Amino acid sequence: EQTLKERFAEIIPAKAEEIKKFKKEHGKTVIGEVLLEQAYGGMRGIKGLVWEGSVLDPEEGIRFRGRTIPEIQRELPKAEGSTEPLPEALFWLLLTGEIPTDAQVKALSADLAARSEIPEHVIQLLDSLPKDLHPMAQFSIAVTALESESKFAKAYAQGVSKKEYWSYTFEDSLDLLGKLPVIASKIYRNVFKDGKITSTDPNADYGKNLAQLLGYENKDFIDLMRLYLTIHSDHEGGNVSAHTTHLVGSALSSPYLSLAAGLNGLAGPLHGRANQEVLEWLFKLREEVKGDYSKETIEKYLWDTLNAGRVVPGYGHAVLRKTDPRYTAQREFALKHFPDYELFKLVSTIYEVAPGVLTKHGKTKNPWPNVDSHSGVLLQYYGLTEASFYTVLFGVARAIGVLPQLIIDRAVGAPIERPKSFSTEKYKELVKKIES
Amino acid sequence: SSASEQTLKERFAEIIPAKAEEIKKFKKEHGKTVIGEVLLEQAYGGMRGIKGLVWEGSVLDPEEGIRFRGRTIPEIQRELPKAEGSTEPLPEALFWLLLTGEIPTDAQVKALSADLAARSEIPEHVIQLLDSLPKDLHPMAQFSIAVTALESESKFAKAYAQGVSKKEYWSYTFEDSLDLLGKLPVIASKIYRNVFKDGKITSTDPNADYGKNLAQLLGYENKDFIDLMRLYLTIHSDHEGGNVSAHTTHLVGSALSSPYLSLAAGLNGLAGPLHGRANQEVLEWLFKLREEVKGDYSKETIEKYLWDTLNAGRVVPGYGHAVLRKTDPRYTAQREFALKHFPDYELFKLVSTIYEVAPGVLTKHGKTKNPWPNVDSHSGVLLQYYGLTEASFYTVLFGVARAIGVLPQLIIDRAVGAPIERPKSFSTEKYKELVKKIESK
Ligand SMILES: [Cl-]
Ligand SMILES: [Cl-]
Ligand SMILES: [Cl-]
Ligand SMILES: [Cl-]
Ligand code: NA
């Protein structure tokens, strides 16, 4: 059957031609207005980016090439003996819009595992970084250190034509994706454990190699990694990690430098730390109520939080009107595997009572939980308790989402990203003219 | 007066609240005004033309060139403080102007230079990591690795983790920014000495200004190359907020990553060959021309080479602009430097002959809007004269300069409370649905 590169090579010309015709025929159609408040508001609402793999449906949650989370759980292939969707099969879907067969996904997993060795200078660099250097900084350093392997950088220097760009971007992307479990696990073992790391299993799927390289052989934790990577993979192109990866890649930096920049965005505490923010809040709550998770006690705790002007982390959305389906998938994992874990009893009781309290309080739109309200409890159950590592796991997952878009951007010839700035003095002059 | 002058931090703290209040009122009273339309071709065109960013320090005047806080390049050259003995504007004086909108005094600049020099030591782990990287790992990748490895020093990251009030964010971002700026000459120079020379590096001079320490750490103690570094850093410092390195730095900073992680990401954007290698692209083209014409820089031979290039379908790098309607004043400042220091250097004679002949040829060929040169047409020849010939290092120098422009905007963003940047994406199938809806009614 076709490999991923072969299938993409077959289908992308017609999709590129469709976009070219769409741009030419409808490019002058006005699709929105820019308000002054949007320039001073982080470009919120500006329809300015093209991102093929996922789109938020305000009524149903994030969709991956049109599929909801439960549809992805049904349709993607599974490792034998598992019902979790394989994240490398999601990588295939995000890049092509198509579901791979069992045999296709098996060959992609073996290709990723064969590309997973990291060079000596990167092993050395990692082993020497200080333990107080945050795991996200270690992760982006190691990915940037792989730039000497970039096949795209070398092809650009040799003057290849633009038609060949996506092929080299694809090779760097699979090489980089293959290496992330080894980099992430080396950081984990060095900072938090004994510095000793096992070797990639050539016949394992991607989440399974991640779990085992971190040092976790429990079969249910392997299933958690498969699910965690799939659901954290992508969430449109306007979030800071996807956007930064795309922006840096638009200047033709390789996937290594582009993902490293994206990881530095994910490292920002307004983007990548919500799992740890929820966990800290839950731990403080658990201590402060001495484990009393009665509805009365939890309800009071939420009111005392809100009356103090503090947030209930991980609840509320500007747009999505129901629980995030990525939260539900993790709730369903806990109900099947450990429904009586005490920290889960707390998370589940908050889900029962917080929406109603937040509604009555009246200041939270769509007071339902997101993915980050449920991820930490699952990691804790299996002993992965080092919360300063959790955004590294998120970064491995987010590479599954952002690397396909770099490959598609190069196949379709997306140009350098270059919005326009002005100073406040000049915006005031422009506004005065407009209002005249 | 027997009281000391304000430092940079004290002056910014004095003036920023009123400016923040003016921004807040502007947004309140005029936020609903329509300032532009988004066309479908802009979402598929890199957001070109969307008025979506606020960047205080510089704005391109399509009739004059780039302005820094409203001043042209010649005005910057006249009004900024200079080192004793020199006529070049000091880049740390420009850092002051970009952050405050004000021209500092000589004494203020001397004190800022001393503060940057005091902040120049890098930690041992960064020294050892740099000395262990392979010489074949590109200088820009080494540079952003070293900047990221300083994150363990971040004062903003530590304050955020302690739950400090948002009121305090700019102050900690300011400290990290000056700490980072102070270390870039040592980082960039260690890369240069390790990769290209003998690995041996001098130490920072506490009484030297910023460009002078960069020049001496690279290995140069002679006045004219010191002056080149002062000019080079000043003119490359800033160019609006929509270029990839400025935009990436702001975008990553908007998620509250520290200046170390923000600048490292911006440096990875500057490393992209569509953004940070135009100096080297011009150099390569000049060297190919020089070999082909065997050093004959007569106007007629250069005119024929340019016509032959254009007639073959090839481009003349470094000429032509989309909006700017005359020669880039940053090019002119570099030409003035060459005419003062080495007017008959051979590679400058070639650059000068192109400057004389290319605008006319490009105009007559008729496919180049505004057929005048930009900054990158002139920077490589100046570095070559002084023996800094390793082109794969040139974007590191640009990155040192660009930190002067982007770090003030991170500090300002935190002082005014700029929010996380989050434009919206759609897939092509959803854009098609949205366009059909618009074009149907
Ligand atoms: Cl996200
Ligand atoms: Cl985001
Ligand atoms: Cl620029
Ligand atoms: Cl740019
Ligand atoms: Na090597």
XYZ file of N, CA and C in Angstrom, chain A residues 188-189 198-199 201 204 207-226 382-384:
87
model
N 13.521 13.799 31.037
C 12.839 13.222 32.205
C 13.793 12.391 33.070
N 14.502 11.486 32.445
C 15.368 10.577 33.222
C 16.485 11.364 33.869
N 16.325 3.453 28.502
C 16.226 2.250 27.689
C 16.353 2.624 26.217
N 16.175 1.652 25.332
C 16.337 1.901 23.906
C 14.984 1.784 23.202
N 12.118 0.515 20.968
C 11.693 -0.766 20.397
C 11.324 -0.537 18.929
N 7.529 -1.012 18.193
C 6.525 -0.357 19.022
C 5.934 0.845 18.299
N 3.406 6.227 20.944
C 3.082 6.399 22.372
C 3.698 5.333 23.253
N 3.711 4.073 22.782
C 4.363 3.037 23.548
C 5.866 3.283 23.719
N 6.574 3.706 22.656
C 7.988 4.032 22.857
C 8.169 5.212 23.815
N 7.327 6.259 23.712
C 7.394 7.352 24.691
C 7.252 6.820 26.124
N 6.194 6.045 26.379
C 5.971 5.552 27.737
C 7.179 4.742 28.238
N 7.647 3.801 27.416
C 8.726 2.920 27.875
C 10.035 3.648 28.010
N 10.318 4.598 27.107
C 11.536 5.385 27.300
C 11.481 6.281 28.550
N 10.304 6.756 28.971
C 10.227 7.503 30.205
C 10.476 6.585 31.392
N 10.291 5.273 31.190
C 10.497 4.297 32.261
C 9.225 3.635 32.716
N 8.121 3.764 31.982
C 6.810 3.270 32.395
C 6.415 2.111 31.481
N 6.307 0.930 32.034
C 5.905 -0.217 31.228
C 4.453 -0.617 31.443
N 3.761 -0.009 32.398
C 2.362 -0.385 32.638
C 1.541 -0.221 31.350
N 0.790 -1.268 30.952
C 0.092 -1.271 29.690
C -0.962 -0.172 29.661
N -1.582 0.143 30.823
C -2.604 1.182 30.845
C -1.958 2.563 30.703
N -0.764 2.753 31.233
C -0.072 4.032 31.003
C 0.318 4.186 29.535
N 0.706 3.100 28.879
C 0.946 3.135 27.449
C -0.309 3.613 26.714
N -1.489 3.073 27.098
C -2.727 3.544 26.502
C -2.983 5.003 26.832
N -2.663 5.431 28.058
C -2.806 6.862 28.338
C -1.925 7.692 27.414
N -0.684 7.284 27.168
C 0.144 8.122 26.265
C -0.451 8.179 24.859
N -0.975 7.049 24.342
C -1.598 7.084 23.039
C -2.730 8.089 23.035
N -0.489 7.213 37.578
C 0.550 6.263 37.160
C 1.919 6.621 37.729
N 2.007 7.677 38.515
C 3.265 8.052 39.142
C 4.076 9.090 38.399
N 3.526 9.657 37.312
C 4.262 10.712 36.598
C 3.808 12.004 37.249
